[PDB]
Design a protein around this ligand. Sequence first.
Ligand SMILES: O=C(CCCCCCC(=O)Nc1ccccc1)NO
Ligand SMILES: [Zn+2]
Length: 358
Amino acid sequence: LVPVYIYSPEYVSMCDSLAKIPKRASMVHSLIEAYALHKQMRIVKPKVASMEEMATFHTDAYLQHLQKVSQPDSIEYGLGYDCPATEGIFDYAAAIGGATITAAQCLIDGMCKVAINWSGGWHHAKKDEASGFCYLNDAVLGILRLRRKFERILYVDLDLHHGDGVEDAFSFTSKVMTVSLHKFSPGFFPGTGDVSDVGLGKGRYYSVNVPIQDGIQDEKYYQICESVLKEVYQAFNPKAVVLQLGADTIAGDPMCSFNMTPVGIGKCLKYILQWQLATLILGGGGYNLANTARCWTYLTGVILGKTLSSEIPDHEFFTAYGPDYVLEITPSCRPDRNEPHRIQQILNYIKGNLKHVV
Ligand SMILES: O=C(CCCCCCC(=O)Nc1ccccc1)NO
Ligand SMILES: [Zn+2]
């Protein structure tokens, strides 16, 4: 009845080797270890995602190319600047999926109410192509696995970016719903998913997308979140939840767009949690490394329902939390360019869309 925490040194170190965020998992796990919160969770070692296990969603050519490469044909398979070809990513990606699959497996074995995989949450990678630092849509692998025991699954995406890859995969079906809350403005990755984009075919209206602009703090974010999800849950009536809790919305992230504190996102986490559903907790974006570790450290708190010591404790990465050495984050002071006009104009458009589900 206690939460499953996906950890191993071998995993964490694989996850530190992803170029675009060196030492982030180390840091994350470390601040958590430091607050001793891992001792209040069942630590589960993640399995290696088998060639087939990954092939559930990723077209086998890809998963074969990415293996040779990890030991010319790189530009085909979506690799680029965003996604280097570091020998060897094949194991890196195969550890994130495996972790997310392991977490989902616990949930479906009845091992826990909640499973955590901070290292996962790569909501961009497509079936045949890498995109957005994402090599492997581990959420998709998480949801697919969850779909063996549970009927209706709900993906909620609270990362700064659009969960496009998760949206894509389940845009056709009505058996999975995606709520993504993100920035929308052209040029800004991935530049898919305006409110209008709602899912196609047998699963039309089964894709929510909330476009938001810079400046938004907790107060207003919880509003849009508590709103949407309330109407989504009542309508969709899901059997399990998959949460992507990207850190790049938070103040101090060099991506400097939203203005969240972990408290605000944690209020949303508190909300989703009260549903007493099976819940898969994934990370995502996080580019202020300390703020990220602060953030997911915090969140593990609310999952465990344990309020945390404000003073950061000493450990490996203590120095990173200076100068003020605390868990809380101060919002930056800059305009909330979300006119309260357009917000209500967005709720309705969504609210009316939910009158169709299902
Ligand atoms: O945050 C993410 C993945 C990030 C992918 C967005 C692309 C941003 C990017 O590549 N910008 C950049 C590249 C090099 C240096 C500075 C910014 N998931 O939501
Ligand atoms: Zn992001």
